[PDB]
Every structure is written in structure tokens, then in C-alpha cells.
Amino acid sequence: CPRFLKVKNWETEVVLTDTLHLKSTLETGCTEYICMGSIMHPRPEDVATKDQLFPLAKEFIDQYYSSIKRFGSKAHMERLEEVNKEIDTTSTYQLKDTELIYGAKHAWRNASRCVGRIQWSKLQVFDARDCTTAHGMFNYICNHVKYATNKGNLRSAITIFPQRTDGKHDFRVWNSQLIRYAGYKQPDGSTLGDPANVQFTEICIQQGWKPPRGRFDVLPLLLQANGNDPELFQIPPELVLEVPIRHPKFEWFKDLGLKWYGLPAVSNMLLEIGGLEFSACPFSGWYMGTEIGVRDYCDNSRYNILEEVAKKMNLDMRKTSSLWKDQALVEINIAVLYSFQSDKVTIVDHHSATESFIKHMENEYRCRGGCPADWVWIVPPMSGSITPVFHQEMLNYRLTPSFEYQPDPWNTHVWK
Amino acid sequence: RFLKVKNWETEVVLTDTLHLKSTLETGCTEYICMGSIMHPSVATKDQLFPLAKEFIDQYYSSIKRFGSKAHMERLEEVNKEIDTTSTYQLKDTELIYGAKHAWRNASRCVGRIQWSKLQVFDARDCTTAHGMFNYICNHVKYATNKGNLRSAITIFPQRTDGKHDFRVWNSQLIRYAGYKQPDGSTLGDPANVQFTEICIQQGWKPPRGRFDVLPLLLQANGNDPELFQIPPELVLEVPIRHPKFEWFKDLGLKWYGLPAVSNMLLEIGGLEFSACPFSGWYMGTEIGVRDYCDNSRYNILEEVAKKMNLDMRKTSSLWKDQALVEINIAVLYSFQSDKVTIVDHHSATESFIKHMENEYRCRGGCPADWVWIVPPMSGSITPVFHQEMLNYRLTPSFEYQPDPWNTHVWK
Ligand code: HEM
Ligand code: HEM
Ligand SMILES: Cc1cc(N)nc2cc(-c3ccc4c(c3)CN(C)CCO4)ccc12
Ligand SMILES: Cc1cc(N)nc2cc(-c3ccc4c(c3)CN(C)CCO4)ccc12
Ligand SMILES: Cc1cc(N)nc2cc(-c3ccc4c(c3)CN(C)CCO4)ccc12
Ligand SMILES: Cc1cc(N)nc2cc(-c3ccc4c(c3)CN(C)CCO4)ccc12
Ligand SMILES: [Zn+2]
Numbered sequence: 001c002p003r004f005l006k007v008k009n010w011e012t013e014v015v016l017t018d019t020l021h022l023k024s025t026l027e028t029g030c031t032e033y034i035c036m037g038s039i040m041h042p043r044p045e046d047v048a049t050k051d052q053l054f055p056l057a058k059e060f061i062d063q064y065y066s067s068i069k070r071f072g073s074k075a076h077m078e079r080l081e082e083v084n085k086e087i088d089t090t091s092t093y094q095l096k097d098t099e100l101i102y103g104a105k106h107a108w109r110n111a112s113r114c115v116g117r118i119q120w121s122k123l124q125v126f127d128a129r130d131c132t133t134a135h136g137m138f139n140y141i142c143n144h145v146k147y148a149t150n151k152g153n154l155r156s157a158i159t160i161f162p163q164r165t166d167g168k169h170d171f172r173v174w175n176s177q178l179i180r181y182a183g184y185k186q187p188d189g190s191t192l193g194d195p196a197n198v199q200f201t202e203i204c205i206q207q208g209w210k211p212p213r214g215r216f217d218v219l220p221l222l223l224q225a226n227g228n229d230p231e232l233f234q235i236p237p238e239l240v241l242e243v244p245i246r247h248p249k250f251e252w253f254k255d256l257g258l259k260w261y262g263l264p265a266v267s268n269m270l271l272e273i274g275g276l277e278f279s280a281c282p283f284s285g286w287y288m289g290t291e292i293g294v295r296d297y298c299d300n301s302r303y304n305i306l307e308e309v310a311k312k313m314n315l316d317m318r319k320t321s322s323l324w325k326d327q328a329l330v331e332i333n334i335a336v337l338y339s340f341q342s343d344k345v346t347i348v349d350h351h352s353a354t355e356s357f358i359k360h361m362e363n364e365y366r367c368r369g370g371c372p373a374d375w376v377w378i379v380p381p382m383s384g385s386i387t388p389v390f391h392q393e394m395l396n397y398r399l400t401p402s403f404e405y406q407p408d409p410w411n412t413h414v415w416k
Numbered sequence: 417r418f419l420k421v422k423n424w425e426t427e428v429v430l431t432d433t434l435h436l437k438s439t440l441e442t443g444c445t446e447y448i449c450m451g452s453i454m455h456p457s458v459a460t461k462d463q464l465f466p467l468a469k470e471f472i473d474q475y476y477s478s479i480k481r482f483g484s485k486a487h488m489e490r491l492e493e494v495n496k497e498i499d500t501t502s503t504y505q506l507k508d509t510e511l512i513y514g515a516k517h518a519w520r521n522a523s524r525c526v527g528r529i530q531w532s533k534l535q536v537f538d539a540r541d542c543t544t545a546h547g548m549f550n551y552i553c554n555h556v557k558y559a560t561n562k563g564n565l566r567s568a569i570t571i572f573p574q575r576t577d578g579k580h581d582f583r584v585w586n587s588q589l590i591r592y593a594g595y596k597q598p599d600g601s602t603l604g605d606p607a608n609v610q611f612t613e614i615c616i617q618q619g620w621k622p623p624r625g626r627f628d629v630l631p632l633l634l635q636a637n638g639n640d641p642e643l644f645q646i647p648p649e650l651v652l653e654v655p656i657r658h659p660k661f662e663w664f665k666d667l668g669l670k671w672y673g674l675p676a677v678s679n680m681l682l683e684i685g686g687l688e689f690s691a692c693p694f695s696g697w698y699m700g701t702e703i704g705v706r707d708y709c710d711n712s713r714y715n716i717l718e719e720v721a722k723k724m725n726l727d728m729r730k731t732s733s734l735w736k737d738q739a740l741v742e743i744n745i746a747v748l749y750s751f752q753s754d755k756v757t758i759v760d761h762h763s764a765t766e767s768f769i770k771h772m773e774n775e776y777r778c779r780g781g782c783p784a785d786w787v788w789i790v791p792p793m794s795g796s797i798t799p800v801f802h803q804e805m806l807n808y809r810l811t812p813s814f815e816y817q818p819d820p821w822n823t824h825v826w827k
Contacts, residue, residue, distance in 0.1 A: 001445065001447065001448070005448070007453070008454075010454070021447070021448050024447045024448065026447075027446050027447065028444065028445075028446060028447060028448065028449045029449075030442070030444035030445065030446065030448075030449045030451075031442075031444065031445070031446060032441050032442065032444065032445055033435070033438050033439070033440075033441065033442060033808060033809075034419070034435050034438070034442060034444075034806055034807065034808045035442045035443075035444045035449060035450075035451050035806070035807040035808070036449075036806065037444075037449050037451030037452075037786065037787070037807070038451075038786035038787075038803075038804055038805045038806075038807075039421070039804050039806075040422075040424070040804065289732075306797070320760055320762040320763055321700075321748045321749075321752065321760040321762075321763070322745065323741055323744060323745050323748070323760070323794075325762065325794065325797050326741045326744070326793065326794045326797070327741050327745075329794060329797055330734055330737045330738050330741055333734060333737070334733065334734050334738075337732045337734070338732075341732065349731055349732040349734070351731035351732075351736065352731055352732070375451065375452035375787055376451065376452075376786055376787065379795070381795055381796030381801065382737065382793065382794050382795065382796065382797075383736065383737045383740060383793050383794075384790070384791075384792050384793060384795055385701075385792030385793065386717075386736050386737070386740055386793075390792065392452075393452055393453050393454065394452045395448055395449075395450065395453075396448070396449040396450075396451070396452075397447055397448045397449070398447075
């Protein structure tokens with residue numbers, strides 16, 4: 001590996017120099033002969049053995065004491081010794097509160113696919129490592145939602161449940177986000193509600209949930225403590241801030257009956273710090289408008305929102321070259337942004353977010369020596385080339401602490 | 417080993433074995449991916465013969481005559497020719513095969529379902545810039561075809577010692593000049609400001625309009641390049657108007673019909689063709705008229721939004737996005753109305769998915785660069801957005817080469 005790699009911005013001609021990639025610890029999936037940059041992800045018995053844990057913990061503790069300008073100190077050496085004794089005698093170790101907070105913020109700071117990382121150091125960390133039951137998890141999650149929502153002035157936050165021990169006592173949130181709408185596949189094939197959530201909805205109903213069978217039924221929480229079987233809980237509806245979607249010019253848009261929830265809280269990823277694995281760690285921020293997945297709702301039978309909007313706009317839907325899909329996609333995204341701003345719910349448009357990210361990326365190159373960034377996920381899903389990330393070259397690599405994918409729990413769980 | 421790629425809308429999984437036959441580096445490593453870097457990075461007798469062999473082998477394998485009589489005879493003939501001349505010459509059949517397969521292997525090209533329909537013009541006998549101009553005129557006339565555009569490539573003599581290169585200095589056969597105004601705005605096409613100044617310094621007398629077709633600057637056998645004017649009756653153009661906004665035509669915009677890329681290098685069996693202009697037809701989003709100045713301060717993007725009376729105070733109004741869609745509607749509407757071949761990004765990406773399926777079935781895979789295949793607008797409502805791809809470098813190939821004015825020893 002060469003010591004300095006350059007990235008160029010082809011609009012501004014600015015060149016940045018990356019050295020931070022020398023600190024990457026996980027494989028990308030690419031090789032010198034093949035690039036897997038567009039692959040989305042390139043057993044339970046296995047937890048870190050003692051001998052695998054030692055070097056990962058040292059690397060994290062070193063990095064932590066380096067960041068607080070205490071590298072090589074008495075404090076640093078005593079912590080190393082203390083961690084090594086814990087691993088020696090218990091096969092694991094416990095993070096200090098300060099290291100837990102540092103590790104969670106840097107897992108976000110290192111998330112190469114996240115365009116909102118300019119915010120990385122303003123993360124509220126909730127330590128739920130004292131949790132023991134699904135009821136306790138529900139309590140912790142309700143407080144998280146209430147704190148993060150903050151009556152529409154959203155605050156990014158993470159709640160960290162106990163780390164993995166032997167792999168048979170994992171804490172898991174089975175939801176993919178804390179707030180999602182149910183989806184119901186009808187006998188004739190059409191979809192009621194959110195088609196993205198049909199499978200998990202079926203699991204909840206299988207587990208005993210009584211579905212209202214509407215378009216916007218907030219799913220229950222499915223929570224697993226200490227490897228036990230997961231248990232169902234209803235989020236108090238007053239904790240779920242929602243926004244009705246309307247359009248600033250099209251009076252008929254509201255008649256589509258659409259709304260969306262304010263808080264994106266992803267809960268099916270894994271947080272890795274110093275070799276420790278926090279398999280339940282829901283984190284939340286606020287939305288970028290393009291993320292809001294209302295366009296895939298069915299309006300009726302075979303017409304989704306995108307098509308219905310085009311019909312109501314009276315666009316020519318016969319030929320594709322009329323760009324009716326593009327026109328309707330813009331109007332939907334205009335409606336989303338206008339509705340959140342009107343109700344004073346935090347949201348960011350893709351122009352502002354990518355513009356902030358470029359400034360963040362420059363600051364990180366200057367102050368940190370690099371900024372891992374996954375162009376394939378950073379560029380927004382519409383109007384790519386008119387955002388400043390499109391012509392920005394990026395280097396992708398995996399730093400630790402990190403957020404990682406993990407198997408869906410229903411595939412791996414051993415039912416009691 | 418075998419590698420799988422999933423489409424997350426259709427859940428189709430394809431299995432890639434063809435990447436195993438790749439031997440040029442991508443730029444990535446196990447620890448750093450350079451998928452968004454635009455370019456991450458003469459032949460001796462010893463280097464040449466294995467490359468020539470590999471290509472001859474795959475050629476005779478493709479015509480199902482591997483290990484045949486004529487196959488063995490060709491390897492011996494090529495080997496002897498490298499030994500005595502330090503290079504070798506491709507047969508016409510091989511030249512056509514190689515050119516089509518360089519297109520087939522262009523991982524960044526969404527239009528490759530057409531790869532086998534390519535008219536190849538052998539210009540390896542050319543000796544002078546005048547001859548290059550002749551070959552290029554014939555290429556343009558054939559490819560334009562009164563608006564029924566036909567894909568084509570013209571291939572000039574291969575590199576020898578590196579001091580006698582043939583080069584087309586233009587980036588495309590047809591482009592508009594760009595004039596940086598002391599004002600501060602740009603007259604004409606801002607993307608061509610540098611080459612425009614090189615043409616002026618070379619003696620071109622600029623008309624200083626908005627749509628001045630640049631002269632050809634042609635370099636034969638390493639000599640200094642020479643200027644030529646393409647006959648205007650050969651340059652097919654389309655006035656840009658809008659099917660609903662009658663004021664769009666008042667922006668006075670137009671574009672040329674023939675995209676013909678002339679600054680890339682074609683590599684076949686170890687031989688290097690530094691002058692090989694290739695042309696097809698446009699995808700509507702490629703047409704970079706949005707970056708024109710309408711006045712001394714506002715973009716076509718800004719001018720369109722202004723005439724649509726959009727709110728341009730805040731980005732969240734998405735005025736840029738709205739105007740961008742309307743400019744692309746007009747481009748497509750204008751080419752179709754004038755019966756000039758064009759493809760929209762929905763049809764093109766849809767065709768590319770079908771191309772991938774074909775290629776995985778018959779070839780074992782298809783190298784594809786997601787970063788370049790996804791169109792520059794409305795990405796997620798095209799079928800390629802959710803299509804996983806594998807990117808790898810197969811030869812024959814089209815390659816980047818430095819601008820000739822940074823390497824040329826002037827005399
Ligand atoms: C504060 C406002 C935030 C915004 C606007 C934002 C924006 C985004 C967007 C637009 C994506 C890609 C979405 C997609 O492709 O569908 C993303 C991905 C991601 N975000 Fe952020 N994010 C925010 C906060 C956070 C926080 C607080 C965390 C964690 C502490 C986080 C961690 C991640 C990760 C790990 C990914 C990649 C997920 C994956 O690989 O599957 N984000 N973010
Ligand atoms: C026939 C219709 C064709 C269409 C619609 C088409 C479309 C495109 C598009 C949209 C791009 C990317 C454009 C950009 O990023 O600005 C591209 C790239 C490319 N095209 Fe095609 N193309 C066509 C024909 C051809 C032909 C005939 C050749 C050569 C024989 C070719 C070779 C290439 C190459 C080499 C690239 C990548 C350039 C690079 O690596 O820098 N294309 N094509
Ligand atoms: C905190 C936060 C705020 C926000 N506005 N967007 C976010 C988007 C993601 C995200 C985006 C894509 C994605 C996944 C998560 C899940 N992985 C595991 C599957 C692949 O797809 C995560 C967190 C977000
Ligand atoms: C290559 C690539 C780049 C990028 N930026 N995002 C991607 C997102 C997905 C994705 C994954 C799961 C998913 C959906 C999208 C949404 N729909 C289709 C419902 C099913 O859930 C797949 C590939 C992506
Ligand atoms: C034949 C044909 C038809 C068509 N419709 N589009 C095309 C686009 C390209 C192309 C696209 C992008 C690009 C470059 C060329 C030049 N390289 C050297 C720098 C990187 O940028 C090439 C050929 C095309
Ligand atoms: C990462 C990436 C992906 C992609 N799909 N396309 C890209 C195109 C360029 C590009 C490079 C040079 C250039 C222009 C575009 C055109 N304008 C900006 C005039 C100046 O020349 C750079 C990066 C790209
Ligand atoms: Zn890569």
C-alpha cells in the first residue's frame with residue numbers, strides 16, 4: 001500500500017491527499033483484479049477467542065488514548081494491563097463509559113456510506129448495558145424515541161445494549177427500524193401498507209400481533225434480551241411523531257391520504273468496538289427527503305404513488321421518453337420536504353446534505369488525514385450529477401469502530 | 417472462484433465466471449476500493465508475444481477453430497513477425513473482432529447491447545493529416561446517415577516507437593467552441609475552453625458565436641497537428657425546443673447529433689491504436705447544454721427555472737431538479753421530432769439489464785461499472801440502481817491516454 005493517495009474533485013479541481021487509509025483494518029471485498037464497490041455486502045458459535053480479542057482491544061485502547069492526547073501515559077498503560085487481565089481471566093472485557101461514547105461516535109464517523117456524518121460528534125449515547133429483559137429494552141427504547149424526537153427538533157442518539165458473550169445470549173432488536181409501517185400481502189397479490197415490510201409484518205403476526213390492517217400501522221417492537229425468545233411491545237402512539245404529506249401547489253396531493261413518520265432509527269445493525277460486538281444498538285438521526293419511501297405505496301390495485309401522481313398530473317404515461325416518472329418523482333420529493341418543514345420536523349434536502357458532506361469531507365482530510373466514503377451510497381438516488389458529490393472522487397475503506405451488517409435474527413435464533 | 421450478483425428489485429441472481437479471465441488491474445486492493453476514481457494507476461518483443469498469443473487464442477476460440485490448422489499457423493506467423501519487426505499486423509478479421517470486443521468490454525458503457533453492430537473502418541494505411549481528415553469525413557457521413565445514426569469506428573495506424581503517434585487532438589469529432597469572456601461568463605460551451613484556445617493559438621479564426629463547430633486538429637505519424645474544417649453539410653444539428661413551453665425555443669439552443677469520441681486509445685493483442693474515433697448515438701442525459709450561459713450571469717438550468725417561475729431562493733424547493741427534468745424532456749422531444757436517433761435513460765438502462773442477462777448466459781458475465789452505468793438523474797427509478805455489478809478489466813479494451821499537448825515534442 002502506498003503512503004499517499006490523492007482524490008480529485010472534477011468540478012472545483014481541488015485535490016485532497018489521503019493518509020488515513022493506512023489505518024484500515026477490514027477487507028473491502030475488492031481485489032487488485034475485481035471491484036465489488038456495488039455489492040451491498042461483499043456463524044453464531046464463533047465469538048472472539050482470547051487470542052483474537054487481545055490485539056483488537058489493544059488497537060482500540062491505543063487509538064482512544066491517542067485521541068485524548070494521553071498516548072503512552074501511565075493511564076494508558078494501566079488501562080492496557082487492566083483490559084488484558086480481564087480478557088485473560090474472563091475471555092472478554094468491559095468498556096469504560098468514556099470509551100463506549102468515543103467508540104460509538106467514531107463508528108458513525110467511520111460509516112463510509114453515510115452522507116450525514118458532519119454531525120458525527122453530536123451523538124447522544126445511552127448506555128443500556130445494565131439491561132436484562134425485553135421489558136427493560138422497551139423502556140430504554142421508549143426513552144430513546146422520546147429524547148430523539150424532541151417534539152420535531154430531532155436529536156441524533158444511540159442506545160447500546162449488552163455486548164455479545166458466548167453468542168447464545170445475544171440482545172437483538174428484530175425490527176429493522178424502531179418505527180416502520182406494516183405491509184400486508186393480499187390473497188390477490190396487491191399490497192396494503194408498505195411493501196418493504198411484508199416479511200417482518202408476517203413474523204409479528206406469527207408472534208401474536210393483532211394487525212389493524214390499515215395503510216400506516218406502526219409495527220410493534222420485537223425485542224430479544226439475553227438470547228431469550230423475542231417479545232412484542234406496542235410503542236405508545238403519542239411517542240410516534242408523523243407528518244401528513246401535502247404539496248405546496250397541488251391541492252389534490254393531500255387527497256392521496258399519505259403520511260410518514262419523523263424519526264429514522266435503524267436497529268438491525270451491529271456496533272463493533274475493540275473487538276466487542278453490540279448486536280443491539282439502535283441509532284437515529286433525521287431524514288434526508290429522498291429517503292422517505294412513500295412512493296412505493298399502492299394507491300389502488302396496480303397503481304403506486306409514482307404512477308398515481310403522474311395520473312393526477314395528467315402526464316403522458318405511454319412513452320418513457322416523456323420522463324413522466326422523473327417529473328412525478330420530483331413532485332413527490334417536493335411534497336415531502338414541504339410537509340416536514342411546514343410542521344417544523346427536522347429534514348434535510350439532498351442538495352444541502354451533499355453540500356455539507358463535501359465540507360465535512362474536506363475538514364476530515366485536513367484534520368484527520370482522510371475520510372472513507374462510498375460514492376455508490378453517498379450520491380443521492382435522484383439528480384445525482386447536480387449535487388456536488390457526483391464529481392467528487394472518493395476512497396472507500398473500513399475503519400474501526402464500525403457499524404456492521406448482521407444476519408436477520410429469525411434465521412439464526414434457537415427457539416426456547 | 418465464482419461470484420454472484422443480485423438484483424434487489426427482481427431478486428435475480430447471476431453467477432460470474434468471466435472475471436476469472438481478467439488480468440489487468442482495476443486499481444482497488446483488499447483494503448481500499450477506488451471505484452469512484454476516474455483513472456486509477458512502448459511494448460517490447462518479450463511483452464508483445466504473450467499478449468498477441470492471448471488475443472489470437474481467444475479469437476480462434478470465438479470462431480470455434482481453437483487448436484485448428486489456421487490457428488496454429490497464425491500463432492507461428494505472428495511469432496515470426498514479432499521476432500523480425502518487433503511488432504505485428506492484425507488481419508482484417510481480427511481488427512473487426514478486436515474493435516467490437518473492446519466495446520463489449522467497456523465496463524462503463526450502458527449502450528453495449530449494440531456491441532456486435534459496429535461498422536469498422538480500417539485506416540491503417542493512412543500516412544498524413546489530410547488522409548486522416550478524409551477518413552474522418554467519411555466516418556461522420558456514414559455514421560450520421562441523415563439522422564438514422566449508425567455506430568462506427570475508424571482505426572488509424574498503431575503506435576510504433578512512440579514518436580510517430582497518430583492522434584486526434586479533439587476530444588470528440590464534433591464539439592462546440594467555448595470562449596472565456598473577460599466579463600467572467602462563458603460564450604459557447606464551457607467544457608471546451610482549453611481546446612478552443614489551443615485551436616486559436618494554432619491559427620484557427622474563431623467566429624465567436626455560441627455554437628461554433630471546432631476545427632479538427634489532426635496529428636499523423638508524430639508530426640505537428642494540422643487544422644481542418646469539417647464540411648458544414650456533414651454536421652447534423654437539432655434545435656432544442658420544449659413540447660409544452662413555447663419559450664424554450666427562444667433560448668436559441670441546439671446540439672449536434674453525432675457523439676464521436678476521439679481521444680481514447682484502443683488496445684488489441686498488445687498493439688496500441690492511439691487514433692481510433694468511435695461513435696454511436698446519444699443518451700439524452702449526456703447532452704451538456706445545461707451548462708451553457710443564457711446571459712452574462714445565469715445558466716440554462718437557472719434560466720429555465722427562472723422562466724418556469726420556480727422559487728429559486730431555497731434549494732429545498734427542488735427548483736434545480738424540476739428544471740433539469742424539463743431540459744431533458746426538451747432534448748428528447750427535439751431529437752425525436754427531427755427523427756435523429758436518441759435514447760432516453762429509462763430505455764437505455766432497461767436495455768442494459770437485458771444485455772447483462774444475455775452476457776451472463778452466453779459469456780459467463782459482463783464487466784460493469786455501477787458508478788458510470790447509473791444515469792446522472794433519477795438513478796433509483798432506473799433498473800440499474802438496484803442491480804449489483806462486478807467491475808473488471810478485459811482485453812481488447814478502450815483506454816485513457818494523456819492529452820497530446822502534454823506529450824508532443826513540437827518542431
Ligand atoms: C443525522 C442525520 C443523518 C442523515 C441525514 C443520514 C443520512 C444517511 C443516508 C441518506 C444514508 C443512505 C440511505 C439509503 O441509501 O437509503 C445513510 C446511511 C447510513 N447511516 Fe446515516 N444519516 C444520519 C445519521 C446517522 C447516525 C446518527 C448514524 C449512526 C450513529 C448513521 C449511520 C449510518 C450508516 C451505518 C449508514 C450505512 C448503512 C448501511 O451500510 O447499510 N447515520 N445515512
Ligand atoms: C450506440 C449508442 C451508445 C450509447 C447510448 C452509449 C452510451 C454511453 C454513456 C451514456 C456513457 C457514459 C457517459 C458519461 O459518463 O458521460 C458511455 C461510456 C462509454 N462508451 Fe458508450 N454508448 C454508445 C456507443 C458506444 C460505442 C459504439 C462505443 C465504442 C465502440 C462506446 C464506448 C464507450 C466507452 C469506452 C465508454 C467509457 C469511457 C471511459 O471509460 O472513460 N460507446 N457510453
Ligand atoms: C441514522 C440514519 C438516519 C438516516 N436519515 N438514514 C439512515 C439510513 C441508514 C441505512 C441506509 C441504508 C441501509 C441501511 C441503513 C440498513 N442496512 C443494514 C441495509 C442497507 O441499507 C441507517 C441509518 C440512518
Ligand atoms: C447498489 C446499491 C446502491 C445504493 N446506493 N443503494 C442500494 C440499495 C439497495 C436496496 C436493498 C434493499 C432494499 C432496497 C434497496 C429498496 N427496495 C428495492 C425494497 C427492498 O429493500 C440495493 C442496492 C443499492
Ligand atoms: C461512442 C459513445 C456514444 C455515447 N452516447 N456516449 C459516449 C460516451 C463516451 C464517454 C463517456 C464519458 C467519458 C468519456 C467518453 C471520455 N473519457 C476519456 C473520459 C471520461 O468520460 C464515449 C463514447 C460514447
Ligand atoms: C465519479 C464519476 C462518476 C460518473 N458517472 N461520472 C463522472 C464524471 C466526471 C467528469 C470528469 C471530467 C469532466 C466532467 C465529468 C464533465 N464536466 C465536469 C466538465 C469537465 O470534464 C468525474 C467523475 C465522475
Ligand atoms: Zn473496488
